[PDB]
Amino acid sequence: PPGPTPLPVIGNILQIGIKDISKSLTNLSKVYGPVFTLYFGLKPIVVLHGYEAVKEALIDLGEEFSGRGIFPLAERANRGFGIVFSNGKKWKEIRRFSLMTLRNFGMGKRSIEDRVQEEARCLVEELRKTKASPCDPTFILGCAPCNVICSIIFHKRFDYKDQQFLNLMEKLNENIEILSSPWIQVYNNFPALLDYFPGTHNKLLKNVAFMKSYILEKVKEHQESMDMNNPQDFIDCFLMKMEKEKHNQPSEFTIESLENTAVDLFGAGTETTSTTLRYALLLLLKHPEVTAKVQEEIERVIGRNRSPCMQDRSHMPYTDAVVHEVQRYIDLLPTSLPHAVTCDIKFRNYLIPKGTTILISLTSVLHDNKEFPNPEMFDPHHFLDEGGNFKKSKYFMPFSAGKRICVGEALAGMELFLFLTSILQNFNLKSLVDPKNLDTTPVVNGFASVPPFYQLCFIPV
């Protein structure tokens, strides 16, 4: 399986660098084809580039490519596996459980949707506190997705001033800061350095364990007041899954694994949604024509009176296109999360041995030159036909694809749709640095893009 010849100890780092590694992968694909080999120091990585290879692996050999693969830093920073990093029956069975409970009406009288709607009108209330004055939305937008997960795991959101909530928030955001430092790919190239610089990974381990404790005291309060035959949140359903398993007791569901699945949901369920929303508003500032068009659909379909809901989305194609086009443009997980093969397998006639790490290039699919003609340009017509109707694409994979597809695809769709429409129904976004100037080009470091810093005022309508 071809690829550039790597140097003695520094792997392929001269060829890919430490900057925008997804761009380097596209360039390498131009010379080695859609299936190349790449060395992260001494570790052999198969990269899959265009749609055809990604679809052929993740969908057609779905089981064979179902494995999760772990780079050095994550290996050291993770004590205990839940869902994101699990493999085999542990992953198969917890993931299955989690999707069950993440369905709209999958645990109690309260739906996921009602959770997201409650959050939407609190999000709006807090933005109303900003008194139409310049503000960095990073924090407020960060709280809403975290709080949806709080409500899903604990039945009950927290006021945004609740100190339980701010600690969990502080702990989650610090993990995102540590993890966005450019010299994180330096660890994956030279893992020896983890020992010589353990600051990173010790801070991750300390933060996770803080969160694990907090959750533990939560599942205790649950074990106490828990009504079987009447589960109301994630913890309840897990606790009672433990009872239906307490007999045949090898057993994948335990207090350890619930803590682990819980921290994952918080980590996987906060950062990406938060950034997508922050980036959405940035783009809505830059392109006010687009914003004006979304507001016409809101006044027409939903009033100014009631609150949005999911049934409204089928009747709002432009807004569905904007949401779709934010996710595709911004390409927040350029190489999703590293995959790994389940056994020795010939792929496009190449032979790839069991447990070999795979990087899926989601960028190559999301920014396919042909499906999306100006792919590095923000344009909702990418998902509209000549009438105003919504136009699906099989190249829309920001949640990846196949057997490891984001467990929260639906939830994220609800959050994005309901928080964005809720914000634009209630406010007009005013820029302070004038649309024309401000730059919306992703700041990329390794496998993580983020918008540049901006401010805006939320002026009520």
How many other β-carbons are positioned within 10 Å of the β-carbon of residue 251? 13
Torsion angle (degrees, nearest 10) of CA 243, 246, 250, 254: 40
Q: Which stretch binds ligand HEC (CB under 6 A): 12-20, 42-50, 115-123, 406-414?
A: 406-414
What number of chain residues touch ligand HEC (CB under 6 A)? 25
Q: Could you tell me the end-to-end alpha-carbon distance of the chain, in angstroms, rounded to an integer?
A: 58
Angle between helices 317-330 and 409-426 (to 10 degrees): 120
Identified binder of ligand HEC from the candidate list 337, 358, 366, 423, rule CB under 6 A: 337
**Least distance in Å: CB of 259 to ligand HEC?**
15
Say how far apart CA 360 and CA 358 lie, in whole Å: 6
Closest to ligand HEC by CB, 204 vs 407, is 407
Tell me if 326 contacts ligand HEC by CB under 6 A: no
Say how far apart CA 239 and CA 244 lie, in whole Å: 9
Tell me if 375 contacts ligand HEC by CB under 6 A: no
Say how far apart CA 65 and CA 402 lie, in whole Å: 9
Tell me if 398 contacts ligand HEC by CB under 6 A: yes
Tell me if 47 contacts ligand HEC by CB under 6 A: no
Tell me if 186 contacts ligand HEC by CB under 6 A: no
**Least distance in Å: CB of 145 to ligand HEC?**
6
Tell me if 201 contacts ligand HEC by CB under 6 A: no
Amino acid sitting at position 166: L
Question: Tokens 């069991």 — which residue?
Answer: 354
Tell me if 336 contacts ligand HEC by CB under 6 A: yes
Q: Which residue is nearest to ligand HEC (CB)?
A: 408
Burial class (CB in 10 A: 0-12, 13-18, 19+), 130: middle
What burial letters (b/e) apply to 196-218, b meaning 16+ CB within 10 Å? Answer: eeeebbeebeebbeebbebbeeb
Say how far apart CA 118 and CA 132 lie, in whole Å: 22
Residues 6+ apart with CB under 8 A from 416: 273, 276, 277, 280, 323, 326, 327
Torsion angle (degrees, nearest 10) of CA 196, 197, 200, 202: 60
Kindly state the tokens that stand for 226: 């828990």
Closest to ligand HEC by CB, 120 vs 194, is 120
Tell me if 262 contacts ligand HEC by CB under 6 A: no
Tell me if 450 contacts ligand HEC by CB under 6 A: no
Residue 340: which of 360, 324, 320 has the closest Cα?
Answer: 360
> How far lies 97's CA from each of 36, 66, 342, 357, 391, in Å?
35, 17, 21, 26, 32
Tell me if 268 contacts ligand HEC by CB under 6 A: yes
Closest to ligand HEC by CB, 190 vs 347, is 347
Closest to ligand HEC by CB, 265 vs 282, is 265
| DSSP H/E element including 36 | strand 35-40
Binding residues for ligand HEC restricted to 269-298, rule: CB under 6 A: 269, 272-273, 276
Tell me if 83 contacts ligand HEC by CB under 6 A: yes
Tell me if 153 contacts ligand HEC by CB under 6 A: no
Identified binder of ligand HEC from the candidate list 404, 448, 450, 458, rule CB under 6 A: 404
Q: Is 135 annotated as a binding residue?
A: no
Closest to ligand HEC by CB, 6 vs 408, is 408
**Least distance in Å: CB of 178 to ligand HEC?**
20
Tell me if 84 contacts ligand HEC by CB under 6 A: yes
Torsion angle (degrees, nearest 10) of CA 11, 15, 20, 22: -90
Amino acid sitting at position 192: A
Closest to ligand HEC by CB, 151 vs 336, is 336
Closest to ligand HEC by CB, 33 vs 62, is 62
Between strands 449-450 and 357-360, the pairing is unpaired
**Least distance in Å: CB of 397 to ligand HEC?**
8
Identified binder of ligand HEC from the candidate list 408, 442, 446, 451, rule CB under 6 A: 408
Tell me if 218 contacts ligand HEC by CB under 6 A: no
Tell me if 414 contacts ligand HEC by CB under 6 A: no
Say how far apart CA 224 and CA 56 lie, in whole Å: 49
**Least distance in Å: CB of 153 to ligand HEC?**
10
Identified binder of ligand HEC from the candidate list 143, 239, 265, 316, rule CB under 6 A: 265
Tell me if 78 contacts ligand HEC by CB under 6 A: no
* Residues in the annotated binding site: 406
Which residues fall in the annotated binding site for heme? 406
**Residues within the interface to ligand HEC (CB under 6 A):** 68, 83-84, 95, 145, 264-265, 268-269, 272-273, 276, 332-333, 336-337, 398-400, 404, 406-408, 411-412
